[PDB]
């Protein structure tokens, strides 16, 4: 967990950037391993609780942490995705296969059912945050908004309104700030319509109260092209807006893991 400067070497390859600071490429004497880095008061604290958080995960479609260093900054060192983000993947990557589609979204699920009955909530679920292994290999990213759910909650409130992916958010979220599993299959259904809008931002042009006075109406984004009916329907099915009713991860992976195979098949 507390990893030595001297076995850390950083390169200059800016992989992602925000509010903390900066992203890099870099390598770790475990072999060696090729790492992300994410180099930064409140930031450091935001970082340490992402570390804590990764560190209780381990699931094959989740980024692994391999420690935290102080050095010139605090730096949080993680496995490297070398393909980068999906969004962006499928941007300069126009022509990949709706099967191929259907298997990374599939992975996403199979990994947020880890995450699920781990009782974390991700609370930035978004394409962006995930990483290509390869072009067939899908792994989630960026724990800086997640929460480990209380042992008699099945939510996390908020206290006041941070900076938030809205777009992502379910009606509870920007209601009543209130997150649960059932708040990122919400996020889910977004991503999937990312994902097979070829890394398209989600409800372009529109401002985030736009969205809120579009989804109160009960509207709802329009079918990619060349999107498959049965997964529209999933997506429509994650956008149900009364929690209660929303299916969970288990239910969600389970569809597309009936459907990938169905085409698989094909």
């Known amino acids: 967990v507390y990893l030595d400067r001297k076995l850390l070497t950083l390169e200059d390859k800016e992989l992602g950037s925000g509010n903390f600071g900066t992203v890099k490429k870099g390598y770790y004497q ?20 992402e570390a804590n958080v ?3 995960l381990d699931n094959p479609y989740i980024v692994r942490m391999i420690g935290i260093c102080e050095a010139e900054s605090w730096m949080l060192v993680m496995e490297m995705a070398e393909l980068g ?11 990949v296969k709706d ?4 298997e990374l979204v599939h992975q ?12 974390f909530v991700h609370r930035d679920l978004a394409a962006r945050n995930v990483l290509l292994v390869t072009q067939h290999y899908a792994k989630i990213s960026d724990f800086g908004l997640s929460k480990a759910l209380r042992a008699d909650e ?23 700030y209130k997150f649960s599993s059932k708040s990122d299959v919400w996020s889910f259904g977004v991503l999937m319509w990312e994902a097979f809008s070829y890394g398209q ?25 060349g999107c ?20 969970g991860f288990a239910a969600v992976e389970l569809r597309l893991r009936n459907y990938y195979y169905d085409v698989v098949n094909e």
């Not at 099967?99 to 259907?102: E, G, M, R, V």
């Not at 996403?108 to 009782?119: F, Q």
């Not at 409130?157 to 900076?163: E, I, L, R, V």
């Not at 099915?237 to 929690?243: E, H, I, K, N």
């Open 30 to 49: 475990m072999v060696v391993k090729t790492v992300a880095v994410k180099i930064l008061p409140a930031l450091k604290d935001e970082l340490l609780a």
């Open 54 to 56: 990764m560190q209780q």
């Open 85 to 95: 983000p999906l969004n962006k993947y499928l941007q300069q990557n126009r022509h």
């Open 99 to 102: 099967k191929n589609i259907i």
């Open 108 to 119: 996403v699920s199979m990994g947020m059912k880890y995450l699920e009955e781990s009782n």
């Open 154 to 176: 099945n939510y996390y409130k908020a206290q006041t309104h941070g900076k938030w992916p809205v777009k992502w958010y379910a009606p509870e979220c920007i209601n009543y």
């Open 201 to 225: 931002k989600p409800y372009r042009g529109m401002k985030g109260s736009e969205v809120t006075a579009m989804l109160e109406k009960g509207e709802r984004m329009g079918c990619p092209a």
């Open 228 to 247: 498959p009916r049965e997964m529209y329907d999933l997506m429509n099915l994650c956008w149900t807006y009364d929690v209660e009713n929303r299916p």
